[PDB]
């Protein structure tokens, strides 16, 4: 349906390797979109096409206001182009750099928006597996929007992954609930509960669930995080249960 000459490319958004992402406009509708440009070249040379057609399968047929939209696509046999919803306030990664920490209010608010979106995801049997600030985007009203269902169902940051996954074991939708715990912490503290300087050391830190709270960490948070980051998936809060945590209802600007 679409082709390249359909768009005026604009400002580079991000890099990353996959390829690049550009802001751009549909010539004839004047619509504003994010265009991710992925090279077929390095696509096979690193064998991932199966996860791509599948990111699309999910992200095209999915619909929450807290999930980014794919509109579709096309190719030229050098690259594939994804036609993406554009999130004008950028990454939650960059807000985090910009303010180093977040406050309890913003945080819960993001934890909420993320639980609904995950909740809608898990209703439909889907596990994102890769929610991390760099994949968390922001709408004009400043709402959270999850992107990037690439690794959806050695090598790449361990920080957000739960024991069972990192050890290669049998997992469920409960994994995203560990991520959300790590997320929760990461917002309040400046950096992931399990950070490290190496991947083998982060392997350890995660396997043994070794995290601690800076003094300014309220007990409301200490509780949501302690409960979300239990090694055993059985005893991980349900998504509904999360929305309903005393600390969440008190702080979310829902
Ligand atoms: C300040 S910023 O980092 O947040 N930023 C400017 C970049 N130098 C920025 C980044 C992203 C956006 N919007 C936007 N809209 C839609 C999408 C869809 N995929 N992506 C990826 C996700 C972020 C990682 C970089 C690659 C781009 C999108 N990004 C705006 N401003
Ligand atoms: Mg992908």
UniProtKB/Swiss-Prot annotation:
Activation of CDK1, appears to be an upstream event of AURKA activation. Phosphatase inhibitor-2 (PPP1R2) and TPX2 act also as activators. Inactivated by the G2 checkpoint. Inhibited by GADD45A and p53/TP53, and through dephosphorylation by protein phosphatase type 1 (PP1). MLN8054 is also a potent and selective inhibitor. Activated during the early phase of cilia disassembly in the presence of CIMAP3. Inhibited by the small molecule inhibitor VX-680. One of its GO terms (biological process) is negative regulation of protein binding. Changing residue 199 to A: Reduces binding to MYCN. The keyword Nucleotide-binding applies. Its EC number is 2.7.11.1. GO terms for cellular component: axon hillock; basolateral plasma membrane; centriole; centrosome; chromosome passenger complex; ciliary basal body; cytosol; germinal vesicle. Phosphorylation at Ser-207 decreases the kinase activity. Ubiquitinated by the E3 ubiquitin-protein ligase complex SCF(FBXL7) during mitosis, leading to its degradation by the proteasome. Ubiquitinated by CHFR, leading to its degradation by the proteasome. Ubiquitinated by the anaphase-promoting complex (APC), leading to its degradation by the proteasome. Ubiquitinated by the CUL3-KLHL18 ligase leading to its activation at the centrosome which is required for initiating mitotic entry. Ubiquitination mediated by CUL3-KLHL18 ligase does not lead to its degradation by the proteasome. Keywords: ATP-binding, Cell cycle, Cell division, Cell membrane, Cell projection, Cilium, Cilium biogenesis/degradation, Cytoplasm, Cytoskeleton, Isopeptide bond, Kinase, Membrane, Microtubule, Mitosis, Nucleotide-binding, Phosphoprotein, Proto-oncogene, Serine/threonine-protein kinase, Transferase, Ubl conjugation. There is a cross-link at residue 132 (Glycyl lysine isopeptide (Lys-Gly) (interchain with G-Cter in SUMO2)). It catalyses: L-seryl-[protein] + ATP = O-phospho-L-seryl-[protein] + ADP + H(+); L-threonyl-[protein] + ATP = O-phospho-L-threonyl-[protein] + ADP + H(+). ATP binds at residues 17, 36, 85-87, 134-135, 148. Changing residue 29 to R: In a colorectal adenocarcinoma sample; somatic mutation; reduces interaction with TPX2. The modification Phosphoserine is found at residue 207. Changing residue 211 to A: Decreases the interaction with phosphatase type 1 isoforms. The keyword Repeat does not apply. Changing residue 48 to M: In a metastatic melanoma sample; somatic mutation; constitutively enhanced kinase activity. Residues 7-248 form the Protein kinase domain. Highly expressed in testis and weakly in skeletal muscle, thymus and spleen. Also highly expressed in colon, ovarian, prostate, neuroblastoma, breast and cervical cancer cell lines. Induction: Expression is cell-cycle regulated, low in G1/S, accumulates during G2/M, and decreases rapidly after. Mitotic serine/threonine kinase that contributes to the regulation of cell cycle progression. Associates with the centrosome and the spindle microtubules during mitosis and plays a critical role in various mitotic events including the establishment of mitotic spindle, centrosome duplication, centrosome separation as well as maturation, chromosomal alignment, spindle assembly checkpoint, and cytokinesis. Required for normal spindle positioning during mitosis and for the localization of NUMA1 and DCTN1 to the cell cortex during metaphase. Required for initial activation of CDK1 at centrosomes. Centrosome amplification can occur when the cycles are uncoupled, and this amplification is associated with cancer and with an increase in the levels of chromosomal instability. Part of a complex composed of NEDD9, AURKA and CTTN; within the complex NEDD9 acts as a scaffold protein and is required for complex formation. Identified in a complex with AUNIP and NIN. Interacts with FBXL7. Interacts with CPEB1, JTB, TACC1, TPX2, PPP2CA, as well as with the protein phosphatase type 1 (PP1) isoforms PPP1CA, PPP1CB and PPP1CC. Also interacts with its substrates ARHGEF2, BORA, KIF2A, PARD3, and p53/TP53. Interaction with BORA promotes phosphorylation of PLK1. Interacts with CIMAP3. Interacts with GADD45A, competing with its oligomerization. This is Aurora kinase A. The gene is AURKA.
